[PDB]
Amino acid sequence: PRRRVVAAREILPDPKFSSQTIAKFMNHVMQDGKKSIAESIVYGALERVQEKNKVDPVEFFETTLEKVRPMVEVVPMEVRPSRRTALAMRWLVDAAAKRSEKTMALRLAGELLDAAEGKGAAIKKREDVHRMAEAN
Amino acid sequence: PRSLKKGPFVDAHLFAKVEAAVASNSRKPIKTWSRRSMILPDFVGLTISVHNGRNHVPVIVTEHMVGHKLGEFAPTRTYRGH
Amino acid sequence: GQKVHPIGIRLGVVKRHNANWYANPKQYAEYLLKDLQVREFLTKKLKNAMVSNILIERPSGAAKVTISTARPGIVIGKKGEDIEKLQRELTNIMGVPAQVSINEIDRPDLDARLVAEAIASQLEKRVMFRRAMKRAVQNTMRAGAKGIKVEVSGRLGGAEIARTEWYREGRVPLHTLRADIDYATMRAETTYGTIGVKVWIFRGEILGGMKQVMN
Amino acid sequence: AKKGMINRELKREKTVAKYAAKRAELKATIANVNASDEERFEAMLKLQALPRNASPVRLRNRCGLTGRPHGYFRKFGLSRNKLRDTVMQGDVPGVVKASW
Amino acid sequence: NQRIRIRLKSFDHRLIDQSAQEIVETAKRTGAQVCGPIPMPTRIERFNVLTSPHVNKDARDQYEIRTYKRLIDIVQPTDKTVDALMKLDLAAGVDVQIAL
Amino acid sequence: TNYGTGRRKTATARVFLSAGTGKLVINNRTLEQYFGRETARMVVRQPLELLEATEKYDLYITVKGGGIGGQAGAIRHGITRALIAADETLKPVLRQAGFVTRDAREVERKKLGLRKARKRPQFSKR
RNA sequence: CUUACCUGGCCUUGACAUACUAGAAACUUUUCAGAGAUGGAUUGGUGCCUUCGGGAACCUAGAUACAGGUGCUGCAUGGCUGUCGUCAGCUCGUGUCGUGAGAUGUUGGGUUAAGUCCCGCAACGAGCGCAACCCUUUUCCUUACUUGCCAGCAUUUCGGAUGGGAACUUUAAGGAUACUGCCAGUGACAAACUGGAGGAAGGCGGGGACGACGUCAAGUCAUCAUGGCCCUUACGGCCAGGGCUACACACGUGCUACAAUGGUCGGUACAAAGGGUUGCUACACAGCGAUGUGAUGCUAAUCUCAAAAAGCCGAUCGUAGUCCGGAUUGGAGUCUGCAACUCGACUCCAUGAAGUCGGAAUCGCUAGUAAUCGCGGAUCAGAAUGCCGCGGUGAAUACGUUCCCG
């Protein structure tokens, strides 16, 4: 701004899991106002990971998000807590875009499983930011 | 194109001229400003001087041009290149 | 910058329209054109009658023209022949029987159009513009207005380079919509061209709004 | 506008009004299905033989005060300049500045 | 089974309300039953008028004009009702249509 | 028995609450028949789920105007108001949940000289 | 046509006004020549008042003062408009200081979106600006109950369809409410500032309109008016055809795409606002279709434009210049119009271009906003991807003022 401090815009929990994390992920996935398509994409991944390996859908996503979470900006600075999740979600969306499968939901679930086990363009990018942090 | 239920459009003054020539057999060109008139089968074998804005271009009516407007054979713009 | 018309901005707030009739879209245009012709004809004919406001109404298949004037006798005529002639002319123009009514203005110096006409007449008669402006302002302020602004633009005095001169006394709160602001414009035709005259007069704040005005 | 253009417009309206009835009659005869084909053809020929200024498509709306051929606003019969002037003076009933 | 239908059209809602109140009061005084007035939806027409004489497309005035409508129903009309309604004055700016 | 009116984005919902087993009808249709997407169905069921009384009441709902999201919001608002009418003691819980507030957000008008409410035509200083 | 431009054909007190002198009602039919403007033959009518000796329009003939000019000057002007900029500033009177131009007040400390407000002070007092008054939206109440509505009752062809009801939605006039009002903490012991309850809404709730003193010889003599200059068998007026639509090129503003968060097919939901009698059209028939014919209601909360579209469910396509894209061209048509060659819109069959997300650089946007989806209108016989409006779905990010600009 300049003089004011803008209050953060609070988003409602998702109406199915009451999870603001999943709601924010849906918002990151969604394009040009098509909320239902993003809901389908995210929920397909959440249901498919449950079938492939039995964990709680919320807990598995939280653990992977924490794994992909960075902790350094860039002149070094630490990332504030909000930007950690904000940058992890973008990386997980961008990287999951480029894997090849029939539906976007299946690609997203596939890279969720992959990043849970330490392979994914997301955590390559995280280690690249780590390298650049070690540079200075 | 003009609706088929209305038939082709020909100006009366031009049509009378071509009809008179065909009833007779005069070979002198018919001078007209009616670029919008449709070429009819009766027109075949006649010379029509169609106005193009500044001059009257002579057109000799052949069978292949029946169904064209008279103005398609008298271009109105001049262009040779840049 | 440019300023909004003081009457037009208040046409629905504290000011009433000068025309009061209803017409469907088929005759709206004809009615409006005949109204404009009537206004032009009256403005030309009563040039020396000190006429400011003309109100046109079409009650029922007829017409009623109310003329606000400071010269009721000259408008009326010697024996009333002039208002009968005016009724004939207006009926001929409007295509329907018309009734003329007269509203006598008892305070001419608080009417914006009359002051502008007076100033323009002085300018055409070659009175010095600053003297005319200050005389008009002082006369209105003595008459009792709470504010007046007078502006003249053009080749003032015959100068080759045109300019604008204004003079104001009192209060003229142009941005208050509920203020009572009378506004007028007039042209003075001199040997050197056109001089424009603009007059604003402020007569207090109207309270209660259009409900008070009884629209 | 110029006086010549205004008079041209007036003459065109006069011609349209003069030929209004016969044009409608010929068009009805053309649209007739019970009429003979020769009758409809003759009606078409007469319609094409009518003067050009009898056709209403050659009329152009002009401002009722100045004659301007652009910005007409059918409802008021005035072009935009005179419409703005008259509305802001307050001689047009019911019209006010719009805000919402 | 005589029912009087009155429709009021105007460009000024205060004028139309005053006229409707007058009609209702007269009909009630003449000892007749009255239903209304019923406010019908208003018509709003908007216009965009360029303010500059030559070239400023973003400089326009936006005007509007409103048509207000009111409906009044008179049932069980007494003898004096019709005569009183016809004797009622016609105020300028309000169009009154009566149907039997 | 009790009545409520809900409004959201030009959508208005009339809600008639009674005591029943859990029947729910919107415009002579089932909830699943009327709403296609899950979140619309869940928003409607939010108040009774919060109150734990999903099987205590019977709902007769009509709605008009707006879209699917606006109609779902209006139905939720109407159900909240009907519950308030049935019992005034439930108001603190519903207000804490946020169901009592009427969302006054509305489409902003297009403005002269702009492509939209705020979007401006592209500018070229060069 | 518009039309102001070009080619050619025509008129000369003129297409239009006032002043004068004479004769004719005005008008109307049939044609002929001509591209038309025009010109010539040819019918009927010859009308309205009347002190009635003539007059009212209206037309024709003569005459001259004149008309006419989108011809020039926006650097002679009025009026109107843009811009800095919705920037917070701009002024005045009495008193003091200075030989004087000038100064003071208006500066000094906090605060605010604001010269907004509160404190100090050789200053004491005012105006235009800011804010508010005006419109629209969010909650509620009163009046009003049709052409709109249907909670309870009854009958039903299950269609508010019908008795019926005035509850609710809505329609639209008038009111109520919000005022730091209450609590807590700070500020300076002020102006202010932060947090909490209640309330639909809390500190300016959102949006519109409103644009100070001035600046740029800014824009407009082609809306109009107007000083001056210029043309007058022509720089005026009438007509037909052509042009404003040209095309080695360069730039600005847009639309449509490059696809799978998608294309196509089948089924099935949910709006707002506006238009309609020279008009919009239920329904039926014909056509693949644009449309045509018959017919019905509507001067409209009554009938109609009208199908909302994205959405949801199912199938298929499987990353290919493709079942992406829809340029261009060939062949058939429809409608408006006196007339679609130059140069219209739309329909059907066939064709199937560039295009694989776009360098330097640069633009918009802080919330129902951006993004995306459809709907209407003004102009208008026909002719929007533009302009002005309407609703549907509905985000991301603001640590901060170090530098870029103002």
Side-chain angles (χ1 to χ4, degrees):
Chain A
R2 258 278 194 222
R3 74 201 290 181
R4 319 168 308 72
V5 272
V6 274
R9 178 186 323 277
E10 280 305 339
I11 65 102
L12 291 145
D14 87 278
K16 180 170 165 189
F17 290 0
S18 292
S19 188
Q20 300 184 356
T21 325
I22 315 272
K24 205 61 159 175
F25 198 48
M26 257 164 34
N27 286 343
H28 279 104
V29 172
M30 159 190 75
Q31 258 147 33
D32 40 17
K34 321 196 81 173
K35 197 69 159 286
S36 100
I37 292 193
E39 273 152 12
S40 289
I41 288 171
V42 172
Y43 285 152
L46 297 197
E47 304 194 29
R48 202 231 38 92
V49 300
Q50 203 165 356
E51 307 322 278
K52 196 301 297 183
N53 70 85
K54 184 48 46 53
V55 208
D56 184 76
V58 168
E59 296 183 337
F60 180 88
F61 178 92
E62 299 277 66
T63 288
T64 321
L65 221 65
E66 174 63 60
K67 285 175 109 323
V68 199
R69 230 159 249 177
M71 71 308 263
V72 276
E73 320 248 9
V74 163
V75 51
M77 209 138 279
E78 78 294 352
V79 298
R80 46 206 270 260
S82 169
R83 308 184 32 76
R84 297 149 153 261
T85 305
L87 292 152
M89 265 144 183
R90 305 205 217 131
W91 299 353
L92 274 149
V93 161
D94 297 15
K98 294 142 146 142
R99 56 212 282 97
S100 70
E101 266 197 315
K102 294 334 191 53
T103 82
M104 185 42 155
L106 296 177
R107 300 147 212 171
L108 192 68
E111 197 161 328
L112 271 178
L113 306 179
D114 280 24
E117 319 299 309
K119 61 214 55 63
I123 46 56
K124 337 290 173 283
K125 205 207 190 263
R126 179 164 135 66
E127 302 158 340
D128 302 347
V129 190
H130 280 170
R131 297 328 101 230
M132 183 300 183
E134 317 291 290
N136 292 352
Chain B
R2 183 175 176 89
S3 205
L4 293 193
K5 77 177 173 179
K6 304 181 82 185
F9 173 79
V10 181
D11 266 319
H13 44 89
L14 180 62
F15 185 46
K17 281 157 147 72
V18 330
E19 247 185 8
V22 162
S24 56
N25 222 73
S26 165
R27 276 305 102 163
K28 71 198 55 33
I30 319 197
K31 190 221 262 223
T32 186
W33 288 261
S34 226
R35 313 176 40 88
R36 61 183 188 178
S37 270
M38 174 144 270
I39 296 161
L40 288 196
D42 310 30
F43 282 44
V44 169
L46 296 177
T47 324
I48 324 289
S49 318
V50 182
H51 199 242
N52 67 359
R54 73 165 141 188
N55 310 124
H56 285 259
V57 188
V59 179
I60 305 173
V61 183
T62 89
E63 176 61 52
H64 294 296
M65 322 180 317
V66 165
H68 284 65
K69 291 316 188 73
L70 271 177
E72 322 197 38
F73 303 105
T76 65
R77 286 188 202 81
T78 299
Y79 179 66
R80 304 186 208 64
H82 279 297
Chain C
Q2 279 66 62
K3 276 133 206 91
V4 68
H5 201 291
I7 294 169
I9 199 54
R10 308 168 160 85
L11 265 174
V13 187
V14 287
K15 247 80 172 63
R16 282 262 272 176
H17 279 89
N18 297 316
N20 207 23
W21 40 266
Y22 177 78
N24 66 343
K26 316 326 181 83
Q27 45 225 10
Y28 198 100
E30 332 161 336
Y31 283 10
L32 182 68
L33 283 162
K34 282 188 259 214
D35 274 33
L36 297 176
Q37 294 186 6
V38 159
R39 298 181 175 280
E40 184 221 23
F41 167 78
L42 286 190
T43 319
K44 195 194 328 281
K45 175 163 263 305
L46 289 348
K47 175 179 192 26
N48 308 282
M50 267 160 108
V51 166
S52 40
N53 194 65
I54 295 151
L55 167 76
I56 303 167
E57 319 209 287
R58 294 167 178 269
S60 174
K64 168 152 143 144
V65 180
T66 306
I67 303 163
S68 307
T69 179
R71 291 301 177 254
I74 313 79
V75 172
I76 280 280
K78 185 224 167 302
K79 285 186 302 302
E81 53 243 47
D82 281 321
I83 55 71
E84 199 265 331
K85 275 205 40 54
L86 269 194
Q87 285 194 353
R88 241 201 306 291
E89 300 290 346
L90 292 195
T91 291
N92 182 237
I93 299 179
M94 295 194 79
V96 281
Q99 318 282 330
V100 189
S101 283
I102 314 290
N103 202 241
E104 167 209 322
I105 316 162
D106 38 15
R107 292 123 75 85
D109 310 314
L110 313 174
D111 178 336
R113 162 138 276 106
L114 298 186
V115 184
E117 294 205 354
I119 295 173
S121 211
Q122 303 273 341
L123 291 172
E124 291 177 357
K125 264 172 269 284
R126 258 177 272 91
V127 155
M128 283 192 295
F129 74 91
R130 207 178 313 271
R131 158 142 85 245
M133 281 198 324
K134 308 191 305 175
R135 193 193 298 320
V137 157
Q138 157 223 153
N139 261 8
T140 298
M141 291 301 294
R142 226 189 319 107
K146 330 188 80 53
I148 171 167
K149 178 175 39 165
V150 175
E151 169 174 312
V152 290
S153 325
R155 291 173 64 170
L156 309 173
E160 303 234 312
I161 303 266
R163 71 187 191 268
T164 288
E165 290 285 287
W166 60 278
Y167 186 49
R168 162 178 57 198
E169 248 166 56
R171 255 166 51 94
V172 190
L174 275 197
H175 291 205
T176 309
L177 293 170
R178 80 162 149 226
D180 179 346
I181 306 272
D182 206 28
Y183 172 73
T185 311
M186 174 96 228
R187 305 164 56 100
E189 300 296 349
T190 85
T191 306
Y192 295 124
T194 316
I195 284 147
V197 181
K198 286 172 179 183
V199 176
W200 304 252
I201 301 180
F202 171 51
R203 293 168 298 185
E205 299 216 1
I206 293 157
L207 312 163
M210 259 290 144
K211 181 136 95 132
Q212 191 260 56
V213 201
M214 308 145 246
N215 216 329
Chain D
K2 298 189 313 191
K3 297 259 207 96
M5 315 288 320
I6 293 162
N7 283 358
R8 249 189 265 187
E9 199 59 52
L10 265 165
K11 150 185 98 178
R12 282 184 185 122
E13 328 209 59
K14 197 166 323 321
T15 317
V16 167
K18 177 206 209 223
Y19 282 95
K22 183 62 154 253
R23 186 180 171 272
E25 172 215 290
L26 302 161
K27 269 181 181 232
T29 298
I30 276 166
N32 218 351
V33 70
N34 301 335
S36 144
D37 288 294
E38 296 72 270
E39 298 180 302
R40 312 153 108 249
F41 191 77
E42 274 304 325
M44 221 171 51
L45 282 179
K46 295 158 136 323
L47 176 57
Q48 290 170 8
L50 279 182
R52 267 174 197 196
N53 278 330
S55 180
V57 302
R58 302 163 57 83
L59 302 181
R60 178 85 173 201
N61 289 329
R62 292 181 175 268
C63 171
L65 281 185
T66 70
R68 197 182 203 263
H70 277 288
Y72 176 62
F73 292 101
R74 281 155 180 230
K75 188 212 189 33
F76 308 104
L78 302 173
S79 277
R80 55 161 175 100
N81 319 70
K82 290 300 153 128
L83 176 69
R84 197 297 186 76
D85 282 335
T86 317
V87 167
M88 285 321 243
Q89 273 168 42
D91 316 329
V92 193
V95 187
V96 295
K97 285 270 265 176
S99 46
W100 72 95
Chain E
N1 205 6
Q2 31 175 1
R3 193 201 47 200
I4 289 330
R5 267 250 166 103
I6 312 153
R7 290 163 177 104
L8 314 190
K9 277 222 200 114
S10 171
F11 294 139
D12 190 0
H13 73 78
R14 291 169 236 261
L15 284 191
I16 204 149
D17 279 327
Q18 186 195 321
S19 269
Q21 278 298 328
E22 222 182 300
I23 296 175
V24 163
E25 262 139 44
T26 316
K28 275 186 196 306
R29 264 175 20 204
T30 206
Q33 291 249 108
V34 180
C35 311
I38 299 131
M40 295 286 160
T42 310
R43 193 202 166 167
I44 306 163
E45 298 167 86
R46 303 252 181 66
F47 310 91
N48 298 270
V49 180
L50 294 189
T51 46
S52 190
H54 189 228
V55 280
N56 288 107
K57 187 69 165 291
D58 292 357
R60 336 183 190 185
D61 276 355
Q62 302 190 300
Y63 305 129
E64 77 198 13
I65 184 174
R66 313 216 176 169
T67 306
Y68 310 92
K69 186 180 189 178
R70 298 284 183 282
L71 174 75
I72 279 139
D73 261 328
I74 303 172
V75 278
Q76 298 279 348
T78 325
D79 168 358
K80 338 171 194 173
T81 311
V82 188
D83 314 64
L85 297 176
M86 251 42 93
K87 284 192 311 180
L88 257 176
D89 51 275
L90 289 180
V94 179
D95 157 74
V96 168
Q97 297 285 312
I98 283 163
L100 314 92
Chain F
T1 286
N2 295 281
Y3 174 74
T5 287
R7 287 203 199 79
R8 177 74 158 99
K9 285 181 148 186
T10 75
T12 310
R14 312 162 55 224
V15 179
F16 286 92
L17 194 60
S18 147
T21 85
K23 315 215 211 333
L24 167 53
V25 158
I26 309 189
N27 281 340
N28 318 315
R29 286 204 246 159
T30 325
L31 176 58
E32 292 74 20
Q33 270 183 273
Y34 197 81
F35 281 132
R37 35 194 302 221
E38 303 290 340
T39 83
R41 281 198 278 266
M42 269 102 87
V43 151
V44 168
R45 287 191 303 246
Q46 279 207 247
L48 279 186
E49 254 148 37
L50 163 78
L51 275 204
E52 313 263 346
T54 315
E55 270 97 15
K56 270 59 161 312
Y57 305 92
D58 271 1
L59 285 153
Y60 187 78
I61 297 149
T62 83
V63 67
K64 267 150 46 153
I68 56 188
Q71 283 188 350
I75 288 162
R76 191 186 80 182
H77 198 230
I79 291 171
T80 307
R81 287 191 155 173
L83 287 164
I84 289 327
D87 270 318
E88 288 83 358
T89 69
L90 311 157
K91 195 146 152 145
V93 152
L94 290 163
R95 167 166 292 273
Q96 192 84 48
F99 301 159
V100 182
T101 301
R102 206 277 200 201
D103 211 0
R105 288 182 298 172
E106 69 143 39
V107 175
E108 184 173 329
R109 58 161 282 188
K110 188 188 164 319
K111 294 201 242 303
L112 167 66
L114 307 169
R115 294 270 163 72
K116 294 171 82 186
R118 312 257 177 123
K119 170 193 216 193
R120 219 166 262 278
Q122 166 166 301
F123 164 75
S124 166
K125 140 185 169 190
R126 276 80 42 226

